[PDB]
Amino acid sequence: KLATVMAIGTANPPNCYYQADFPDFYFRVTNSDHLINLKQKFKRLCENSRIEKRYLHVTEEILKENPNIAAYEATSLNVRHKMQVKGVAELGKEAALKAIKEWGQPKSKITHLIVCCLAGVDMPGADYQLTKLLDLDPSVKRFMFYHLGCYAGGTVLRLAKDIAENNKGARVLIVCSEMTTTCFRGPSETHLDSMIGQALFGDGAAAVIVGADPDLTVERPIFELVSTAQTIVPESHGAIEGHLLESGLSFHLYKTVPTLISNNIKTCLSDAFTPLNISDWNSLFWIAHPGGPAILDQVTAKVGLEKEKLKVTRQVLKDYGNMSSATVFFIMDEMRKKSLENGQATTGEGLEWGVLFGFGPGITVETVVLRSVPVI
Amino acid sequence: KLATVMAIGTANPPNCYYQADFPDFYFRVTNSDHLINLKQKFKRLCENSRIEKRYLHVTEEILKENPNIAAYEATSLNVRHKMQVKGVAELGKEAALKAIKEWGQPKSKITHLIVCCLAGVDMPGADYQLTKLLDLDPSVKRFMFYHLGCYAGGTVLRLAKDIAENNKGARVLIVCSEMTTTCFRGPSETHLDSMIGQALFGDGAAAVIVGADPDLTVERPIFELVSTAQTIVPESHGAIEGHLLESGLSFHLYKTVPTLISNNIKTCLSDAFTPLNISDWNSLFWIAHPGGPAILDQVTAKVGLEKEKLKVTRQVLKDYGNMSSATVFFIMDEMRKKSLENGQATTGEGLEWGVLFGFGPGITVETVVLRSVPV
């Protein structure tokens, strides 16, 4: 009996930022208007990001009250951290309550809690905070992950699968709460890397319930976790790095990232599906972390995917931007919603087998083989 | 077939600090000799710590070159992080190589890697670094835990047990590498508890191999992981806290910690052993995180343990100080060594069942039921 995702809930900050208006907002609040040429590159960057809007905790008021955050590099960890710690917990609670509602069981049945946050280090951590906020059993077995990054959506499922399958009756609550307040910062002409993050990253939290052997009279399976794997892409050292400094979390990205990832995807697919006698990549439903539009385009081309294979993935990127580890769950959620609306036979666009990909620092690739569930 | 610890290796920085000389050293290098009353308080903390020596990366030279680290509160995260990241990887590598040697199998057989560090956040992290340093399979399945604290020794075993038991043939390498460069700072008259950290915390790394269904023709089991649990001590909110700030990792410890832990430990014992029909706490071998001398004294008295039941735990505290998550493994390592030297029948001082306790921020208590292996 495979570990199964039985519920998904999501949340985002109330501040919506349309990408079409971001360049002006961003350069205005960071006092970079005098950098005309730099703003031209950023504008094109946003225009080609394939992101229509994002939800961010940051506001003009917050920046006015904390100018060191708006600076490309100024001591500001303490102020960022204060908001980061409070925000990840609040957003996480909202998503968790929505997942618990869909699950249909009382929260007292939750036996394990996995919390994943890009940033917001605290001791005790967000797992402790959420256990208190949600009033979970004090003996809930917790796992807290700080600073993993965008591949973590796969990491938490990999962990949840083993917990649920080795502990009879175990019901795992997963919460990936991502906030970019820790990394928001002004532009730098000598560091075009950081600028990319300012155009692609958005805030959001996703929560899911995972368990093996569902009680079908109350629980309702969405996707089954068949197998999981993690690997480091060859010759990718230093391509994606993040450092926690006195000025917050930094972001460094090689231009080779899309090429490095796309060129290795077929290897990940082969390792994951050969044991299952599957070789047709178009026969699978796809849930891939949208690091950027370039990555989706390259994966599609190199893998040989039909043009609409990553439709849901692209829709989430368009509607929310890159929300790090939480993103794949927003995609998972929308996929079963769209499948139902299209009257398809399974939660996976009517297909039986699928794959979920998490990409991040390493470069690390998390590969999760999924199985859809029948839909009436 | 239960997940089993099949190897343990440890490492420590080369700089040894005798506790008897630490008060003078600490107040001298932090330029606090004029604070006579504060010094007497620190002196007593060190004298009552029951710690004889500790190994630390920090040196007088490093403090001289970095006044912002010696200061109680000065912007210094960047410089602390630089050393912290290098240190955890280096100590971790040394401990891991020792564990791999004892294990008896080639490192290419490691399928999972769990790394736990009090501090040193980096992306990619220490798990990625160790994979490269040890030249492990690039497809090794990794888990990286930053900023958990002193209860984490239990946490990593709790994780390793489920990994090993749900994946046939899985062999898990665990590395708990703790460095205090991130939290070392001068004393504060307004925050008297902050210096408790400079009196008790030492550096060290421990690595262990965990796997189910041992191939007895090559692997040699040490302890079996029977069951795991984690809980939050009632009414303990805010007793143990740590915040990663511009001045590094802060340390806050309330005076209620010893009693909060000792007065609730029987509950953890009952929850773990009632299912095993065990109620005599002295019939078990004990491996407890030595958060401090008071915790060990109170647990012994309140649980009704024989005076020498925690002998090994106290010896490790004496020889290395509190090394956060790595500590319980140093204790586990020494217990099986003493058991052999004392001609006892099992790795657990001749006893069959045992318990390992991790204590930390929460207050969180990790309870791991162990079973010894014949010697």
From Swiss-Prot, chain A:
The modification S-(4-hydroxycinnamyl)cysteine is found at C150. It catalyses: 4-coumaroyl-CoA + malonyl-CoA + H2O + H(+) = 4-hydroxybenzalacetone + 2 CO2 + 2 CoA. The active site is at C150. GO terms for biological process: flavonoid biosynthetic process; polyketide biosynthetic process. Signal peptide: none annotated. Pathway: Secondary metabolite biosynthesis; flavonoid biosynthesis. Its EC number is 2.3.1.212. Optimum pH is 8.0-8.8. InterPro entries: Chalcone/stilbene_synt_C, Chalcone/stilbene_synt_N, Polyketide_synthase_type-III, Thiolase-like. Pfam families: Chal_sti_synt_C (PF02797), Chal_sti_synt_N (PF00195). Keywords: Acyltransferase, Chromophore, Hydroxylation, Transferase. The keyword Transferase applies. The keyword Lipid biosynthesis does not apply. GO terms for molecular function: acyltransferase activity, transferring groups other than amino-acyl groups; protein homodimerization activity. Gene3D superfamilies: 3.40.47.10. PANTHER family: CHALCONE SYNTHASE, HYDROXYMETHYLGLUTARYL-COA SYNTHASE. Belongs to the thiolase-like superfamily. Chalcone/stilbene synthases family. Polyketide synthase producing 4-hydroxybenzalacetone. Can use p-coumaryl-CoA as substrate but does not accept hexanoyl-CoA, isobutyryl-CoA, isovaleryl-CoA, and acetyl-CoA as a substrates. Catalyzes the initial key reaction step in the biosynthesis of phenylbutanoids. Homodimer. This is Polyketide synthase BAS. It comes from Rheum palmatum (Chinese rhubarb). The lineage of its organism: Eukaryota, Viridiplantae, Streptophyta, Embryophyta, Tracheophyta.
